[PDB]
Amino acid sequence: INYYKDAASTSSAGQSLSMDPSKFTEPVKDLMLKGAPALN
Amino acid sequence: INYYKDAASTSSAGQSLSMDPSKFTEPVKDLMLKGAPALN
Amino acid sequence: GLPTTTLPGSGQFLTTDDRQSPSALPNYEPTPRIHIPGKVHNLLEIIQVDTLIPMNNTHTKDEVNSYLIPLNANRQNEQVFGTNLFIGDGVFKTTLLGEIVQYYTHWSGSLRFSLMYTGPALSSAKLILAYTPPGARGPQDRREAMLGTHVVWDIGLQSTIVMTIPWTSGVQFRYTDPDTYTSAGFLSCWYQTSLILPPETTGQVYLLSFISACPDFKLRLMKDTQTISQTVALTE
Amino acid sequence: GLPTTTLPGSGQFLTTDDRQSPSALPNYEPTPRIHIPGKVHNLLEIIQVDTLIPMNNTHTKDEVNSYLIPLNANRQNEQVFGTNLFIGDGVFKTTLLGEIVQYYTHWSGSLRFSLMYTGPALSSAKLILAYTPPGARGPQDRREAMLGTHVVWDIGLQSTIVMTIPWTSGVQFRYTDPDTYTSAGFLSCWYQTSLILPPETTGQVYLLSFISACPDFKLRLMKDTQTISQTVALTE
Amino acid sequence: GLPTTTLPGSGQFLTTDDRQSPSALPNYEPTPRIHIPGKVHNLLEIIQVDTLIPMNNTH
Amino acid sequence: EEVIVEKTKQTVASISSGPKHTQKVPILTANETGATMPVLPSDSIETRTTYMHFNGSETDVECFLGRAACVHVTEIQNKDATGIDNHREAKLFNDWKINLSSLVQLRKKLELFTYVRFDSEYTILATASQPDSANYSSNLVVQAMYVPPGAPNPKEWDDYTWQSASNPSVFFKVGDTSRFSVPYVGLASAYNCFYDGYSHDDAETQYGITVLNHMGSMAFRIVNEHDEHKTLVKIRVYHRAKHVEAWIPRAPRALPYTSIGRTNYPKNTEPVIKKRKGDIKSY
Amino acid sequence: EEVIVEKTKQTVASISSGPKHTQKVPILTANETGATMPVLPSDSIETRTTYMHFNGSETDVECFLGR
Amino acid sequence: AACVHVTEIQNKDATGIDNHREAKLFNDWKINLSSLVQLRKKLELFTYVRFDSEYTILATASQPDSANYSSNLVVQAMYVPPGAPNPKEWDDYTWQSASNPSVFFKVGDTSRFSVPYVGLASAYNCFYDGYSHDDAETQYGITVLNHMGSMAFRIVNEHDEHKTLVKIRVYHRAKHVEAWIPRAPRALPYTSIGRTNYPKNTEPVIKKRKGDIKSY
Amino acid sequence: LNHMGSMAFRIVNEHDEHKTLVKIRVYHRAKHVEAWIPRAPRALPYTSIGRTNYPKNTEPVIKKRKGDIKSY
Amino acid sequence: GYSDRVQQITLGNSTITTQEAANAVVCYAEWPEYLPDVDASDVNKTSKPDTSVCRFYTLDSKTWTTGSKGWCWKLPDALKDMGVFGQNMFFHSLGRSGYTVHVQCNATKFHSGCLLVVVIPEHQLASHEGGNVSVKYTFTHPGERGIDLSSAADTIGPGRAFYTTKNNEVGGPVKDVIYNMNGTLLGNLLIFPHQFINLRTNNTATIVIPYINSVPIDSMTRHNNVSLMVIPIAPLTVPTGATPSLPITVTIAPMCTEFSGIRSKSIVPQ
Ligand SMILES: CCCCCCCCCCCCC/C=C/[C@@H](O)[C@@H](N)CO
Ligand SMILES: CCCCCCCCCCCCC/C=C/[C@@H](O)[C@@H](N)CO
């Protein structure tokens, strides 16, 4: 449970579970809806 | 008690206790009772 | 610094040990299970299914005829077949029961011996199946056999008779090994009456024999079987 | 003195093991985190971004032309392009998707295939994109292609069509390895109508193709890629 | 990674030690016990039974 | 011979059954139905009451396939690498196309079923020997690297592939042993022991389980450089199934095998059923 | 192909989607915007319902650079 | 723990040899606790005994002939129950041990494992006043019941330039002991495994007095 | 920016009558990882530490088709 | 009133009638069923033709003589040219199905003989040349005519009409009956779902097969899920004067059939 003083000694951190591709796939200023015309 | 992250690391699963040979010994459509004539 | 003392056997590789070990593929997600029919949990389930016995093993090569027990018409007291009950050898060695039994060192329980008639519907016969516990040799005549465990079978609409070989032993377990002094005993079949063939029919008719384990069957101490071998590793 | 027994594999170095170890720099205080844009948590996030496919890989050397799919005016049923769907090879090997897929042994899920028209605004065309599941070879004519999964694309104000390659497979996962017998199938494009160029315009126009993964994409069993190598260690 | 220090005598085989060890036959089910007469628990029980002394050992 | 009674949570092996004279005949049936009636001894003879005192734990598929079995024996060498154009043929390193069909003992056990799903526990043992002139024996370290299909194959013992940045690999001493688990890695829901199907490469037609058996390879090498003498290192791989699930029991193998993956048997093979010394009436 | 459903905490890989005839056209877009629209198979073909049975743990950067 | 057996195996060139067992490339031990007398006498104080077993196997090496160095060796001990195929060569297929339990350990080191009570009956027999029939020979005594398996030993390594002698010592320790029917302790020396035979023309076991029955 | 230190290795023992070659292999494993700004993966072989240089007269990295753009 | 000998099976526009049956086997006690969402992988909406494919198809009859050794059919291969089922099989890359097999063979109360009717999942065949040779597509996908084992058998060693399709040609399967064409023994075939057609008892065998596979759906032209085998155990014995032969007829009906991945027709060898 606890036998190391430094945090760097611990094992892997585990999965993030908060994976959102939005900042890469849709980094657009104006909201682009799927189904709506890309450019009015 | 708990020192492994992956389930594949654990030891044997142990006995099933739910062993029913029916699906192999009596895979017949119509119920065949022991004592009753096999075919009427 | 936890003080420790390694015990004898430390660092050994016991092929039979059951311990945990590190995964070589961390975070790997195995394919999900789907429903597949015919799941097996225990080998004791499958040996309850009967398979054909090559009772007529008198041929120079393996053939279908090995499973056919001849039945001759118009014979009175004569013997139909006979066999000792070494389930790890003889006519049982290649059956499903015999094969699974050979993976274990000890056995116990009762056996299920079945016989199916395949002659014409208009024929008739009465046979006497006998199980002879160890101590007295195999029966030499029907009178001798009739003194032990037996079933008188009347051939009719129901084609199969299921005789049982009850666990008859002092010691509660027996060796699977055929190179032992004594087995479960002897099994034999005799004409109780005789086979009567209808007109316009001639020749031999046949019996098919089956073997399986009763629900009371037990198997202990896993071992390697002497039914498979190789001289060199196999390649693609 | 705690009694212990070292197990097989004791003292081994499994490059994949995840255990704790003593810190060589005790009491060291790492620099505080500041906000940096563009944080990545999972590789499945980045393969959802599409990158150009070098579909026109018919050149003697790498060039921009490798990404340009030619479109010829006034042609009826002809094929525009074609390709098998081995995502670990061919035209996909160097794309972002292909590159990340090569770090894994198994794949699953649907692919996103996009096509962007770059001809004059006053031109028009209708194309038919087809995805052919494995079993039947690549389509030899539009009639053959039209029988499988397809999209009829009308070129207009919206310059891009996004066809999807739906996960069509029996086994729930496929090998990333291109040296396998079968892949996801085939992809092809045909003139549904034809390319009509406006007056005062001549020559070829081009299509740009993109590839990315849908949200259902899966990747398993990390492995080394065959896209990088060296003969000697690099120096300063 | 539990820090440890092996003590003197580590890896020794003391014929008199009483420790646990892995079973070579996992899941094996031993034959059930039946009642057998004459159970002995301690050697101090049996030495209370007298036996003849070869007192006339002059032969 | 029913299954449950109160004392000690004991299962009864046989019930007390006396004489009978009925129209209910349990010992007569029809095997043509394909069923095996659960006939007990109390159905044909007079029986007394007995208890099982047995759970049948050793015949559970978990136990049956749950012990380590040798699945491969390979050989690598430590000698002068100069002048050699093929490091694999010189045995400086060697790879094993992973499969459980090379050695027959385990193969026969697995083939008792059609589909099997389980996690794997591998144990690799490395031993050395020096058949020629030697002044001493050197301590060596072995590297076992898993090369999944698609990953670059090592061409030389000191290739760049041995960096193993993504491939998992183990390093251990010769004379010592290696051990690791592997989760069920099949593409399907279960492994196939048999496969009645084929594949097409536009060149050759492949039939059988070989079509599905496309695991990777295991590359082995001695990490150390050469000494004045030659060292022979044998590597033995052991496999143990864990968390086993099995489907569709089969007729056990009767004839000897001839090759990996195929169900072929040799022509002009000896009879597998024992021939009697006497006739069908002999004991 | 949405992300959440009740049974076993299961994520759906694809939703049940039937025939379409609409003015809402998800498969047409403009790549010049620099965006990649999240087009799923249910946007171009008729689909059945399937579940992910997958978390994507092996593609986490922790695992990718963690050996 | 008591020593119940000492066997010997060798590591040398296997070429030319037609009998690997006679060359000692591998050796098997018909399991029994009657070979070495110290433990035998203790067990025979009772008629029936039931217990679990703890085995410890010690392997040591030596080189009686010319050698430039000593090699590290690994030993394999495989349990061959009755009915299982017996090894004919040191590199047989039987050594795969797919179902037979076996241990691998270093020479100079030791091996240890438990074995649950494995008798067919409710207790082991130390004595048996009965016989058996094989239609050939009549066997009498405890030998009739003692039908455990064998233990096959071998050096896993191939041969070196020199010959290596490896002695293997097996130790047994009873656990969770139950004993029945105490007996008169053994007075005369033994002659063979299983039999209660004593040698003819044997020395008197009761001490003779220097003086008479009245001496102190 | 790469101005970490150095790792000095040595055999502590003094010399024997013979010469001993000792190879030292260093392995690295990242833990508690955080990453930012994904990039276009490396396509060409490297030439030196730190630099993004590629060799001149290098082989094409994109596979050339056996047939044309219509081939499968 | 009712008995296990008299049964009626109705699938689509076809009905089977029998008055000499011996109950009916439902493989592993599992009735066929459609693929549930929870087990699905392929995202395409599947096609369920129902009554146009889930109906009885009768194959060509076989002749059982005293020299017969056995017959073998592979599913779905045996139905590849059968009506709408066959067509769907070639147009789709994926498909799954259950079956109800009905083997027929009548005689008189003067005849003798016994047939083993068995269904073997994943029946991987052995090659005639032995060693390291693979069976060529043609021989492993025989069609509705199946494989005649009497061309080169194990039991009494005969060469009936052929040795294979043309003759012993590179890539044929080993036709030893006693070895089940795969190195196992005939007598152990009973571990698989089966029934006997014992002439004195019954004249038909019926086996219902659910979809058995390690994948939810699969390629129907490249994979044969089950193999149907009809083997004479007790030889045929006809009465004095009668013809020493008897016809055997096989009728199969697909159940709960699903198809997916529709494109052009499949390209298979031969
Ligand atoms: C550090 C190295 C890691 C190596 C991990 C990869 C090993 C893969 C293990 C899979 C074992 C094969 C499973 C297939 C079993 C079938 O062969 C049998 N059911 C049929 O013979
Ligand atoms: C890894 C190898 C496993 C080997 C397991 C099998 C060993 C069997 C141990 C049984 C010990 C013999 C018990 C019989 C004791 C009698 O000999 C005495 N009571 C009479 O002398």
Coordinates of N, CA and C in Angstrom, one line a residue, chain J residues 60-156:
Chain J
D60 N -29.6 -35.4 -54.2 CA -29.7 -36.6 -55.0 C -29.6 -37.8 -54.1
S61 N -30.4 -38.8 -54.4 CA -30.4 -40.0 -53.5 C -29.1 -40.9 -53.7
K62 N -28.7 -41.6 -52.7 CA -27.6 -42.5 -52.8 C -28.0 -44.0 -52.8
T63 N -27.2 -44.8 -53.3 CA -27.5 -46.3 -53.3 C -26.6 -47.0 -52.2
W64 N -27.3 -47.6 -51.3 CA -26.6 -48.4 -50.2 C -26.5 -49.8 -50.6
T65 N -25.3 -50.3 -51.0 CA -25.1 -51.7 -51.3 C -24.3 -52.3 -50.2
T66 N -24.0 -53.6 -50.3 CA -23.2 -54.3 -49.3 C -21.8 -53.8 -49.3
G67 N -21.3 -53.2 -50.4 CA -20.0 -52.7 -50.4 C -19.8 -51.2 -50.0
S68 N -20.9 -50.6 -49.7 CA -20.9 -49.2 -49.3 C -20.1 -48.9 -48.0
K69 N -19.4 -47.8 -48.0 CA -18.6 -47.4 -46.8 C -19.1 -46.1 -46.1
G70 N -19.8 -45.3 -46.9 CA -20.3 -44.1 -46.2 C -20.4 -42.9 -47.1
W71 N -21.1 -41.8 -46.7 CA -21.2 -40.6 -47.5 C -21.0 -39.4 -46.6
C72 N -20.5 -38.3 -47.1 CA -20.2 -37.1 -46.4 C -20.6 -35.8 -47.1
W73 N -21.4 -35.0 -46.4 CA -21.8 -33.7 -47.0 C -21.3 -32.6 -46.1
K74 N -21.0 -31.4 -46.7 CA -20.6 -30.3 -45.9 C -21.6 -29.2 -46.0
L75 N -22.0 -28.6 -44.9 CA -22.9 -27.4 -45.0 C -22.1 -26.2 -44.6
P76 N -22.5 -25.0 -45.2 CA -23.6 -24.8 -46.2 C -23.2 -25.2 -47.6
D77 N -22.1 -25.8 -47.8 CA -21.6 -26.1 -49.2 C -22.7 -27.0 -50.0
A78 N -23.2 -28.0 -49.3 CA -24.2 -28.9 -50.0 C -25.4 -28.1 -50.6
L79 N -25.7 -26.9 -50.0 CA -26.8 -26.2 -50.5 C -26.5 -24.9 -51.3
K80 N -25.2 -24.8 -51.7 CA -24.8 -23.7 -52.5 C -25.5 -23.4 -53.8
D81 N -26.0 -24.5 -54.4 CA -26.8 -24.3 -55.7 C -28.3 -24.6 -55.5
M82 N -28.7 -24.4 -54.3 CA -30.1 -24.7 -53.9 C -31.0 -23.4 -53.8
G83 N -31.8 -23.2 -54.9 CA -32.7 -22.1 -54.9 C -32.2 -20.7 -54.4
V84 N -33.1 -20.0 -53.7 CA -32.8 -18.7 -53.2 C -31.7 -18.7 -52.1
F85 N -31.5 -19.8 -51.4 CA -30.5 -19.9 -50.4 C -29.1 -19.8 -51.1
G86 N -29.0 -20.7 -52.1 CA -27.7 -20.7 -52.8 C -27.3 -19.3 -53.4
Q87 N -28.3 -18.6 -54.0 CA -28.1 -17.3 -54.6 C -27.6 -16.3 -53.5
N88 N -28.3 -16.3 -52.3 CA -27.9 -15.4 -51.3 C -26.5 -15.7 -50.8
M89 N -26.2 -17.0 -50.8 CA -24.9 -17.5 -50.3 C -23.7 -16.8 -51.2
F90 N -24.0 -16.7 -52.5 CA -23.0 -16.2 -53.4 C -22.9 -14.6 -53.5
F91 N -24.0 -14.0 -53.2 CA -24.1 -12.5 -53.2 C -23.6 -11.8 -51.9
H92 N -23.6 -12.6 -50.8 CA -23.2 -12.0 -49.6 C -21.8 -12.5 -49.1
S93 N -21.0 -11.7 -48.5 CA -19.7 -12.1 -48.0 C -19.9 -12.8 -46.6
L94 N -21.0 -12.5 -45.9 CA -21.2 -13.1 -44.6 C -22.6 -13.8 -44.5
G95 N -22.8 -14.7 -43.6 CA -24.0 -15.4 -43.4 C -23.9 -16.4 -42.3
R96 N -25.0 -16.7 -41.7 CA -25.1 -17.7 -40.6 C -26.4 -18.4 -40.7
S97 N -26.5 -19.7 -40.2 CA -27.7 -20.5 -40.3 C -27.7 -21.7 -39.5
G98 N -28.9 -22.2 -39.1 CA -29.0 -23.4 -38.4 C -29.6 -24.4 -39.5
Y99 N -29.9 -25.6 -39.1 CA -30.4 -26.6 -40.1 C -31.2 -27.6 -39.4
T100 N -32.1 -28.3 -40.1 CA -32.8 -29.4 -39.7 C -32.6 -30.5 -40.8
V101 N -31.7 -31.5 -40.5 CA -31.4 -32.5 -41.4 C -32.3 -33.7 -41.3
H102 N -32.7 -34.3 -42.4 CA -33.6 -35.4 -42.3 C -33.1 -36.5 -43.3
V103 N -32.6 -37.6 -42.7 CA -32.1 -38.7 -43.5 C -33.1 -39.8 -43.6
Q104 N -33.4 -40.3 -44.9 CA -34.5 -41.2 -45.1 C -33.9 -42.5 -45.7
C105 N -34.5 -43.6 -45.3 CA -34.1 -45.0 -45.8 C -35.1 -46.0 -45.3
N106 N -36.0 -46.4 -46.1 CA -37.0 -47.5 -45.7 C -36.7 -48.9 -46.3
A107 N -37.2 -49.9 -45.7 CA -37.0 -51.3 -46.1 C -38.2 -52.1 -45.6
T108 N -38.0 -53.4 -45.4 CA -39.1 -54.2 -44.8 C -38.6 -54.8 -43.5
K109 N -39.5 -55.5 -42.9 CA -39.2 -56.2 -41.6 C -38.4 -57.4 -41.8
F110 N -37.9 -57.7 -43.0 CA -37.1 -58.8 -43.4 C -35.6 -58.3 -43.6
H111 N -35.4 -57.0 -43.7 CA -34.1 -56.4 -43.9 C -33.3 -56.2 -42.6
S112 N -32.0 -56.1 -42.8 CA -31.1 -55.8 -41.7 C -30.2 -54.7 -42.1
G113 N -29.6 -54.0 -41.1 CA -28.7 -52.9 -41.5 C -28.8 -51.8 -40.5
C114 N -27.7 -51.1 -40.4 CA -27.7 -50.0 -39.5 C -26.9 -48.8 -40.0
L115 N -27.5 -47.6 -40.0 CA -26.7 -46.4 -40.5 C -26.5 -45.5 -39.3
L116 N -25.3 -44.9 -39.2 CA -25.0 -43.9 -38.2 C -25.1 -42.6 -38.9
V117 N -26.0 -41.7 -38.4 CA -26.2 -40.4 -39.0 C -25.6 -39.4 -38.0
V118 N -24.5 -38.8 -38.3 CA -23.8 -37.9 -37.4 C -23.5 -36.5 -37.9
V119 N -23.6 -35.5 -37.1 CA -23.2 -34.2 -37.4 C -21.9 -33.7 -36.7
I120 N -20.9 -33.5 -37.5 CA -19.6 -33.1 -36.9 C -19.2 -31.7 -37.2
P121 N -19.1 -30.9 -36.1 CA -18.7 -29.5 -36.3 C -17.2 -29.4 -36.6
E122 N -16.9 -28.5 -37.5 CA -15.5 -28.3 -37.9 C -14.7 -29.6 -38.2
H123 N -15.3 -30.3 -39.2 CA -14.7 -31.6 -39.6 C -13.5 -31.4 -40.5
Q124 N -12.4 -31.0 -40.0 CA -11.1 -30.8 -40.8 C -10.6 -32.2 -41.4
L125 N -10.7 -32.3 -42.7 CA -10.3 -33.6 -43.3 C -8.8 -33.7 -43.5
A126 N -8.3 -35.0 -43.6 CA -6.9 -35.3 -43.8 C -6.7 -35.6 -45.3
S127 N -5.4 -35.3 -45.7 CA -5.1 -35.5 -47.2 C -4.7 -36.9 -47.5
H128 N -5.1 -37.4 -48.7 CA -4.8 -38.7 -49.2 C -3.3 -39.0 -49.3
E129 N -2.5 -38.0 -49.7 CA -1.1 -38.1 -49.9 C -0.3 -38.2 -48.6
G130 N -1.0 -37.7 -47.5 CA -0.4 -37.7 -46.2 C 0.7 -36.8 -46.0
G131 N 1.5 -36.9 -44.9 CA 2.6 -36.0 -44.7 C 2.2 -34.6 -44.5
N132 N 2.6 -33.7 -45.4 CA 2.3 -32.3 -45.3 C 1.6 -31.7 -46.6
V133 N 0.5 -32.4 -47.0 CA -0.3 -32.0 -48.2 C -1.7 -31.5 -47.7
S134 N -2.2 -30.4 -48.4 CA -3.5 -29.9 -48.0 C -4.6 -30.3 -49.1
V135 N -5.8 -30.4 -48.6 CA -6.9 -30.8 -49.5 C -7.3 -29.6 -50.4
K136 N -7.4 -29.8 -51.7 CA -7.8 -28.8 -52.6 C -9.3 -28.5 -52.6
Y137 N -9.6 -27.2 -52.7 CA -11.0 -26.7 -52.6 C -12.1 -27.7 -53.2
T138 N -11.9 -28.1 -54.5 CA -12.8 -28.9 -55.2 C -13.3 -30.1 -54.3
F139 N -12.3 -30.8 -53.8 CA -12.6 -32.0 -53.0 C -13.2 -31.8 -51.6
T140 N -12.9 -30.6 -51.1 CA -13.4 -30.2 -49.7 C -14.8 -29.5 -49.8
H141 N -15.1 -29.1 -51.0 CA -16.4 -28.5 -51.3 C -17.1 -29.2 -52.5
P142 N -17.5 -30.5 -52.3 CA -18.1 -31.4 -53.3 C -19.5 -31.0 -53.8
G143 N -20.2 -30.2 -53.1 CA -21.5 -29.8 -53.5 C -22.6 -30.8 -53.0
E144 N -23.7 -30.8 -53.7 CA -24.8 -31.7 -53.3 C -24.6 -33.2 -53.4
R145 N -23.6 -33.5 -54.2 CA -23.3 -34.9 -54.4 C -22.5 -35.5 -53.3
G146 N -21.9 -34.6 -52.5 CA -21.1 -35.1 -51.3 C -19.9 -35.9 -51.7
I147 N -19.2 -36.5 -50.7 CA -18.1 -37.3 -50.9 C -18.5 -38.8 -50.6
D148 N -18.1 -39.6 -51.6 CA -18.4 -41.1 -51.4 C -17.1 -41.7 -50.9
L149 N -17.2 -42.3 -49.7 CA -16.1 -42.9 -49.0 C -15.8 -44.2 -49.6
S150 N -16.7 -44.8 -50.3 CA -16.5 -46.1 -50.9 C -15.5 -46.1 -52.1
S151 N -15.0 -44.9 -52.4 CA -14.1 -44.8 -53.5 C -12.7 -45.3 -53.1
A152 N -12.4 -45.3 -51.8 CA -11.1 -45.8 -51.2 C -11.2 -45.8 -49.7
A153 N -11.9 -46.8 -49.2 CA -12.2 -46.9 -47.7 C -11.3 -47.7 -46.8
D154 N -11.6 -47.8 -45.6 CA -10.8 -48.4 -44.5 C -11.2 -49.8 -44.1
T155 N -12.6 -50.0 -43.8 CA -13.1 -51.3 -43.4 C -12.7 -52.6 -44.2
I156 N -13.3 -52.8 -45.3 CA -13.0 -54.0 -46.1 C -12.1 -53.7 -47.3

